[PDB]
Design a protein around this ligand. Structure first.
Ligand SMILES: Nc1ccn([C@H]2C[C@H](O)[C@@H](COP(=O)(O)O)O2)c(=O)n1
Ligand SMILES: Nc1ccn([C@H]2C[C@H](O)[C@@H](COP(=O)(O)O)O2)c(=O)n1
Lengths: 282, 284
């Protein structure tokens, strides 16, 4: 039977290890990859190593809120953007004026206020720029056949203001047979560390939008540009490739929610998540 | 011997015919459709101009030089013999989008304007945009020279703020570049793909663009990666495509760049020669 689920991911690791080139403290890398994760009665949270579910869910709610304030995610116990908002790191980018935690116009601002003028992370941007996220939901409801259902985080004008240029440049949604699918264009993928988190994020987003629009989840298609393994991750990845995948968990949404801004972390339960030990890399 | 690059394109047609699902559109005539496909076409001593049906090379090349010029004027392309944008700049089509006031040929802030002036305020097709917004095309060329390992070598045409002014939202949302071993590859994210009429043309445009940037930056072409969103065949085109699928590809031609060129802006159509193109007859 053809490789499905987790074996797509593990297949991509294997391909990089065998066919990737040394491109540099260093990586093995392949340009252009594509995996398909079914979302039908399962949720692609990897089992060969524990994924930081809690980080996935809080990061996403933080984006949905429009927030560009690393402290606002750090308050929920998720520190993954904290280094990017530090005094020293902001100072190194020429942003000595800026308050600690102001990442600039990253995902949350691009998703809700694309094209508005960024001031700081505290400003009110109500009704300013394009609310791409709501515009996606509306189009799914009133014209599911549309082929322009896109949300774009890549904004060349705003790049120089951002703490980090986005890895997730864009996503597109698609509907047929009452199933909502999503494809992510990810320009750069650290396969050991980032990508399992990244798959879970966009699968989570697709579950959320499906729920709001009365559709069932379909596929998550993960497209990569620069797909790489850091050289220090090879040996641990070699341990991991030999573990037997367990079946994917399910994601249960615990109440009927009408607008995407109303989702809360306690609305979500991951069922039957049975991962092998977090055996992870630098 | 490694198989012919074109078999991926014909494979994709076949997967859609076999597994694609009925999905409609504005015209209502209908498609067979799959979401998410990817093909890889080597550009090493070969040019992926499809041979199972003749592709409108002249159209490919003039449109691209038109884009590079930063033009948003259907008439400047039409004047070179290439009518592909004309219907979209006609008084009638523009009126139908509620642009009753706009000059004929003004397509709004489409590819050329996004590539050379992203984020600038669009006025009309004749205005001067020199020094306004981001010149993505040049920033891409500059980054390829000075930092080839960079993972952010991107040129985006998808501008949500400008979408309402465009005569057509772009199919080619973005493209990304990559260098390793002095080879430049390119990946295209195409949000929507008419497999019969547009995809072959599209493969050649980005292959050609990569050849251009490689020549500017002292590199050799590597791969062109074509990634699709909604990949579809119009029901219209099923009989014609079943005809095309019967044909054996001929070997891909080669693309020759006839002089040394310093800046992307200085390419002319006469600079390019397609050697050894041996296509079967045009279809429909
Ligand atoms: N959500 C994220 C964020 C980051 N990265 C990885 C990819 C790169 O290794 C690095 C980002 O660096 P760069 O911008 O140079 O590609 O972290 C990732 O996979 N997923
Ligand atoms: N460069 C282009 C332009 C257009 N199309 C096709 C895709 C769709 O069939 C239609 C545009 O439709 P839509 O905007 O609804 O996706 O033409 C294409 O393949 N390539």
């Amino acid at each position: 039977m053809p490789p499905h689920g987790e074996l797509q991911y593990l297949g991509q690791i294997q391909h990089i290890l065998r066919c990737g080139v040394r491109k540099d403290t260093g990586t093995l890398s392949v340009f252009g990859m594509q995996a398909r994760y079914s979302l039908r009665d399962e949720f692609p949270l990897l089992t060969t190593k524990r994924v930081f579910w809690k980080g996935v869910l809080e990061e996403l709610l933080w984006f949905i809120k429009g927030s560009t304030n690393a402290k606002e995610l750090s308050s929920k116990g998720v520190k993954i953007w904290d280094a990017n908002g530090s005094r020293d790191f902001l100072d190194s980018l020429g942003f000595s004026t800026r308050e600690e935690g102001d990442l600039g116009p990253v995902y949350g601002f691009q998703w809700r206020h694309f094209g508005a003028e960024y001031r700081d992370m505290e400003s009110d941007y109500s009704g300013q720029g394009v609310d791409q996220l709501q515009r996606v939901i509306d189009t799914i409801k009133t014209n599911p056949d549309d082929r322009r259902i896109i949300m774009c985080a890549w904004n060349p004008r705003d790049l120089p203001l951002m703490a980090l240029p986005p890895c997730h440049a864009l996503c597109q949604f698609y509907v047929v047979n009452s199933e909502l699918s999503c494809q992510l264009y990810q320009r750069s993928g650290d396969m050991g560390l980032g990508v399992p988190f990244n798959i879970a994020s966009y699968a989570l987003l697709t579950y959320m939008i499906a729920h709001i629009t009365g559709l069932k989840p379909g596929d998550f298609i993960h497209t990569l540009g620069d797909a790489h393994i850091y050289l220090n991750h090879i040996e641990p990845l070699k341990i991991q490739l030999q573990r037997e995948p367990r079946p994917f968990p399910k994601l249960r949404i615990l109440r009927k929610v009408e607008k995407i801004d109303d989702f809360k972390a306690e609305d979500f339960q991951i069922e039957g998540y049975n991962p092998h030990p977090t055996i992870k890399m630098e």
